[PDB]
Amino acid sequence: CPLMVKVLDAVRGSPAINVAVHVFRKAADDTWEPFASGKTSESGELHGLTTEEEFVEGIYKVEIDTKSYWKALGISPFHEHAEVVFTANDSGPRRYTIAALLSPYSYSTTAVVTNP
Amino acid sequence: CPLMVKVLDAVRGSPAINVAVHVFRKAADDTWEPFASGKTSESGELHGLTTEEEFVEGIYKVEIDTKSYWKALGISPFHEHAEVVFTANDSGPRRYTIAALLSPYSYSTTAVVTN
Amino acid sequence: CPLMVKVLDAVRGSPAINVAVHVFRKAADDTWEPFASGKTSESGELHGLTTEEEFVEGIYKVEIDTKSYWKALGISPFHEHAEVVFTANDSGPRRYTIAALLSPYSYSTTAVVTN
Amino acid sequence: CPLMVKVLDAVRGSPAINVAVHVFRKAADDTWEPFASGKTSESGELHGLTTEEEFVEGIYKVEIDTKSYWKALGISPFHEHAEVVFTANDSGPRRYTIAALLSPYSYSTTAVVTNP
């Protein structure tokens, strides 16, 4: 699994469950093409978005739908969504974990990249 | 000054100087329209992007050009840029500070909204 | 002002006001000795903890009383306090800003060291 | 495993390997008693510090030896060590993951607490 997402909730000290995630790739015409989507599990993890074959070199945008998440917990947060944009696989295939740590008015995001 | 940007460097423990910042406003057709831009000062701050009159309610995107920043320092970064997307509200506090704390493979961003 | 503290609230998107801060210096016998204290202002800042004369090289601990802060807001926090432990150096930049960004179950802390 | 530690390096986008961790408990006389210690693995994780029997209620301090870590990578960091202090097990046994994300002049720490 070459692209995975893991989301934590910094208010509750828990995984952020059921968080929608949309992934896009930059096409040759410079538009954002839909690439994959899913939702975090009870563990706050999202796997199986793509395969090593389909996850070719390119610029990817991982949108994490944080506003929707917070509004279901009765919180009106600042951001619409967290937006993680990066070049992938430009030095050959890698595995990527995109982590995000959520607070109503702040988030952080970290990438862990490994060589298979 | 209703919208300010402040950028820190977590490797050097310093303001992030000369970071390009581009602000966009979401148009009716859901496209991103250029709104304001600048470069952070010696103090890592960017002031005077807009005015109270022009900064109406709506969805904005603040793009922080982190890749170029790390490149100029000879450090290989992960992200193309940092993206901060939010709704500007008239109800709440009047002044928005978008703060960002940069590391090569991680960043955080915080909104400080005050009267 | 060689040592400043700035605290933000990541839940409210605001300065963290009235947060108690205790600074300690490591004594020769490796114990922590009270050095300075205060409470953050309306702007989440604490200035005037020490002077250039008194702030000699050594190991310092800045204790930020985060539990009491969350308690006063009726929110259950994880940490007893935030702890920032560092060596003050004469070689590098002269002014230390210890920044902290608080959430109930997480915090970050950053050192901004400037001339 | 009721107490685990996971450390990431925000410069490299990798687990922080071989990071020393010392855990202390507050004794009835208000001193910090040594409780456990270890080092993060190749995955940046540290398990097996304690058992559910020995991990009783109390105030614990998890010291993560960050300065030593950075100095081996040629970096002179700001902090001596990250110091995570918390009450544990005061509402019955819980599992704790203490995460830390390291940069030379900044770190964050997050707790994920679950009910077994």
Tokens encoding A95: 């595995």
Picking from D8, D12, D105, the nearest residue to B12 by CB comes out as: D105
B7 to chain C: closest CA residue:
C112
* Location of structure tokens 């800042």: C45
For B97, C6, C97, D31, the CA distances from C47, given in Å and listed in that order, are 21, 9, 10, 31
Return all residues near A46 (Cβ < 8 A) that are at least 6 apart: A4, A5, A6, A7, A19, A21, A38, A39, A40
CB atoms D110 and A14 under 8 Å: no
Would residue D52 be called left, alpha or beta, if left means φ above 0 and alpha means ψ between -120 and 50 degrees?
Answer: alpha
Cα distance between residue B102 and residue B12, in whole Å: 10
Contact (CB<8Å) B108/D108 = yes
Q: How far is CA D78 from CA B6, C20, C72, D14, D109, in A?
A: 21, 23, 31, 20, 16
CA A43 to chain centroid, in Å, comes to 14
Cα–Cα distances in angstroms (integers) from residue C4 to residues C7, C8, C49, D33, in the given order: 10, 14, 7, 32
- Structure tokens, D33: 């008693």
**A1-116: which CATH topology?**
Immunoglobulin-like (2.60.40)
Distance CA C86, CA C96 (A): 11
State how far the Cα of B8 lies from the Cα of B107, in Å rounded to an integer. Answer: 10
The secondary structure element, H or E, covering residue C66 is helix C66-72
CA-to-CA distance for B67 and B74, rounded, in angstroms?
11
Residue pair A63/A81 in contact by the 8 Å Cβ criterion: yes
DSSP chain A: --EEEEEEETTTTEE-TT-EEEEEEE-TTS-EEEEEEEE--TTSEE--S--TTT--SEEEEEEE-HHHHHHTTT---SEEEEEEEEEESBTB--EEEEEEEEETTEEEEEEEEE--
* Element at D70 (helix H, strand E): helix D66-71
Tell me the C-alpha distance between A9 and A102, whole Å. 5
Show which residues on chain D lie within 8 Å of chain C, measured between beta carbons: 59, 78-81, 83-87, 101, 105-113
Among chain D residues, the shortest Cα distance to C81 is held by D85
Q: Report CB contact under 8 Å: B10, D103.
A: yes
**What does the block give as tokens for D65?**
């030896």
Residue in D with minimal Cα distance to A103: D110
User: A36: which 2 tokens?
Assistant: 């994959």
Check: CB of residue C70 under 8 Å from CB of residue B70.
no
**Residue set of the binding site of B:** 6, 45, 108
Instruction: Look at the block and give the residue holding tokens 């709704």.
Output: B87
Binding-site sequence positions of C for L-thyroxine: 6, 45, 108
D92: DSSP letter: B
Query: Of C12, C28, D1, A116, which Cα lies nearest the Cα of B115?
Result: C12
Q: Distance of alpha carbon B83 from its chain centroid, rounded?
A: 8
For residue D27, give Cα distances in angstroms to C27, C30, C83, D35. 22, 19, 19, 10
Partner-chain residue, chosen from B10, B14, B112, that has the shortest CB–CB distance to C114: B14
Per CB-CB distance under 8 Å, the chain B contacts of A62 are none
Top residue of B24, B57, B78, B97 to mutate, by most chain A CBs within 10 Å, is B78
| CB count in 10 Å sphere of residue D11 | 21
Q: Which helix (H) or strand (E) holds C104?
A: none
Q: Which of A85, A108, A112 sits opposite B79 (nearest CB)?
A: A85
Nominal resolution in Å?
Answer: 1.6
Other CB atoms within a 10 A radius of the CB of residue C34 amount to 9
Could you tell me if A105 and B113 are in contact, meaning their C-beta atoms sit under 8 angstroms apart?
Answer: yes
Residue closest to C97 by CA, chosen among D10, D70, B14, A26: B14
Cα distances (Å, whole numbers) of residue D51 to D3, D57, D113: 8, 13, 16
For chain A, domain boundaries: 1-116
Residues in C lying within 8 Å of D, measured between beta carbons: 59, 78-81, 83-87, 101, 105-113
The DSSP call for residue B44 is S
Is there a contact between D106 and C108 (Cβ–Cβ < 8 Å)? Answer: yes
End-to-end distance of chain B based on CA atoms, in angstroms?
11
Classify domain C1-115 at the CATH superfamily level.
Transthyretin/hydroxyisourate hydrolase domain (2.60.40.180)
Q: How many CB atoms lie within 10 A of CB C72?
A: 11
Q: Which residues pair with D97 in a beta bridge?
A: D4, D112
> Which chains, if any, share at least 3 CB pairs under 8 A with chain D?
A, B, C
Q: Which residues pair with C82 in a beta bridge?
A: C64
Structure tokens at C9: 């609230």
Name the residue among C21, C99, C18, C86 with its Cα closest to residue C55. C86
Residue C49 DSSP one-character state: S
Q: Is D105 helix (H, G, I), strand (E, B) or coil?
A: coil
Local structure of C64: helix, strand or coil: strand
Method by which the model was determined: X-ray
Joined together, the tokens standing for residue C62 give 């800045």
Question: What is the rounded distance in angstroms from the CA atom of residue B61 to the CA atom of residue B43?
Answer: 22
End-to-end CA distance of chain D: 10
D43 CB burial (10 A radius; 0-12, 13-18, 19+): exposed
List phi, psi (to 5°) of C12: -90, -20
**C106 and D107 in contact by Cβ < 8 A?**
no
CA pair distance B41, B45, nearest whole angstrom: 5
CA-to-CA distance for D38 and D64, rounded, in angstroms?
Answer: 10
Q: Which residue has the tokens 């430009």?
A: A90
For B106, residues 6+ apart whose C-beta sits below 8 A from its C-beta are: A108, A109, A110, A111, B10, B78, D8, D10, D13, D101, D103
Q: Which amino acid is at B103?
A: S
Residue B110 burial class via C-beta count within 10 angstroms: exposed 0-12, middle 13-18, buried 19 and up: buried
Distance (Å, rounded) from C-alpha A100 to C-alpha A44? Answer: 10
| CA–CA separation, C25 and D62 (whole Å) | 20
Strands C95-103 and C3-9: parallel
- Tokens 């933000």 locate to C8
Residue whose tokens read 């917070």? A70
Contacts of C9 (CB under 8 A, 6+ apart): A105, C15, C16, C44, C102
